[PDB]
């Protein structure tokens, strides 16, 4: 079918890819008897939640009819969804930041750099496919622009989440490559005091058999701090790419006048219309996309000739880009 | 001063209390050479962020004047703030849930139960003081109801965050009390294989000197799982207390018709008004609180007698609870 399933299909494909990646990561973790990848899958559950939130928002936005609960339809839901995703991403970012700071004080050494690297390339391929999926992020008949803008907002929130996942995958790949080529781990009997993190066994195990012996150093100190710093950078990048969307979404949900419309010129043109003596309560806001609604309380003098004045005001609003207007004539006290 | 500082003062007092608690926790952590409490302070930074977000929302909502950027003023900001907080809390909840699941697979034993318990009572006192602070969670002149509702939404989002912190403090107190009275830790030389959590050090240290010796058990197995389960319960509770507010906020930002107003009866009364032949584009929504806006396209026949029809329609809207209406008369084609 093709009943406006352009965005729903992409979201469903991304959800399917995320589920396959999560299943593969869980299988790899249980094969190698590792729990870090299981925790990574439980973190990917957040991406799953973001995808299902966007899917719910799109499904509710498909219902554009004027029901009893909502008079404009559930169009803003899509916009709301984007905002939600943005805020969600922001929260995740802060969480990551917190973890990063912890990893700057009690650094953890990664285990099995080769398998972690392979999972990293798998996640990189999945996230690249995702980014390719979301590469694009009387009244006239131009609802196509409104649909494009709402879809752009929602798909852009999901794109921000996928870009965060892709940056995390790049960081994982870089960290695994560095750990495999630079860092030297210690398992049993290796003469390494671990001058890097404070070590529970590498102190007690070594001292019993390294009494003034030829002890060595575990590895480079800067390697263990590559995972936090990069993450921090990614967070910053994410925050940057998260600032517009959120803002825009918030503005759309704050009844903020769209930037393409100026109120001074609009009210000047409204007051310049013949038969109009006063304009008050001129409220202009954006429902979603190109659906801009402007309600004004026009003051007139001749009730008989109100039709021409209303037509001229509607023409002025059409010229200014507003096509869903409600004009109230407050005639003089006769 | 008293220039509408009823909520700003409470938010500032809560921020001050949170900062003193964070400073005390950091001092206690650095005195006892512990980093778990430092991580707890970095997590309290999330409460600080929620408080400053609510403060920003309240400050922007104080600007009720109709500026050029926003025609309704930044009133919805407060509502938006609540939504943000709710979503933020939701994110935190999910994060906690994830951590809880990790603590169900690789449980961590808590250290220094007495000092952790004391920090728990300190946090309990701070959160109880906070809950006491937020214990309360032609057109008529009743903006007091709108202010009350907007403040209730924002202060209720902050109250949800503070209640989450209070539940976390209760869980910390209970866990510390249980660990102090039930669990038995192991530091050096104690014959305890620790069957709860698999530690390579505790196994390697014992086997060299416990060859068929009188070894003992570390402690009860159910104790280490008290921290996750309780947390999970708290999460559920939080989610419950988070569902209404979020919903309400979302509805207010979705232009949803308030539950106190029915559209069938409203449109029936509008069509029953003498001189009205058709009512279309009757859009009713809630700006914030009691500020309900309803714009309709009334169809009339006599342009001269439109004043009485408009007065009757305004009276009908006043009876139905809507006081900011825009009525457009679409007169017959003459």
Numbering used by the authors:
A (entry chain B), B (entry chain A): 1 to 137, 228 to 424
Publication text:
Among the ten hZnT members, hZnT1 is the only Zn2+ transporter predominantly located on the plasma membrane, mediating Zn2+ efflux from the cytosol to extracellular environments, to protect cells against Zn2+ toxicity. The overall structure of hZnT1 adopts a “mushroom”-shaped homodimeric architecture with the transmembrane domain (TMD) and cytosolic domain (CTD) of two protomers tightly packed. Each hZnT1 protomer comprises three parts: an extracellular domain (ECD), a TMD and a cytosolic CTD. The second part TMD of each hZnT1 protomer contains six transmembrane helices (TM1–6), forming a Zn2+ transport pathway.
The first region ECD (residues 271–312) is formed by the linker between TM5 and TM6, mediates intersubunit dimerization through hydrophobic interactions, a feature not observed in other ZnT family members. The distinctive extracellular cysteine-rich ECD in hZnT1 formed an inter-subunit disulfide bond (C291–C291) and two intra-subunit disulfide bonds (C276–C282, C286–C311). This unique arrangement is primarily responsible for sequestering extracellular Cu2+ and facilitating their efficient transport, while exhibiting minimal impact on Zn2+ transport, which expands the extra physiological function of hZnT1 beyond its role as Zn2+/H+ and Zn2+/Ca2+ exchanger. Specially, residues of TM2 and TM3 interdigitate at the dimer interface and establish a complex network of hydrophobic interactions to promote the dimer formation in the TMD. The transmembrane helices TM2, TM3, TM5 and TM6 are tightly bundled at the cytosolic half of the TMD in both protomers, and collectively create a cavity that is solvent accessible from the extracellular milieu but entirely sealed from the cytoplasmic side, indicating that our hZnT1 structure is in an OF state. Additionally, a His-rich loop flanked by TM4 and TM5 is located on the cytosolic side, with the majority invisible due to its flexible nature, except residues 134–136 near the C-terminal end of TM4 and residues 228–232 near the N-terminal end of TM5 build according to the map density. The last region CTD (residues 345–507) is composed of two short α helices (α1–2) and three paralleled β sheets (β1–3), contributing the extensive interactions to stabilize the dimeric state of hZnT1. Exquisitely, the β sheets of one protomer tightly pack against that of another protomer through hydrophobic interactions and four hydrogen bonds between H387–T415 and I417–Q418. In addition, K69, N70, and T71 in the extended loop between TM2–TM3 protrude into the neighboring subunit and tuck into the pocket between β1 and the loop of TM6-α1, establishing pivotal hydrogen bonds with L344, V347, and V374 to further strengthen the stability of hZnT1 homodimer. Superimposing the apo and CDDO-ME bound hZnT1 structures illustrated a noticeable significant movement of H43 and E99, which also substantiates that these conformational changes are indeed attributable to the binding of the inhibitor.
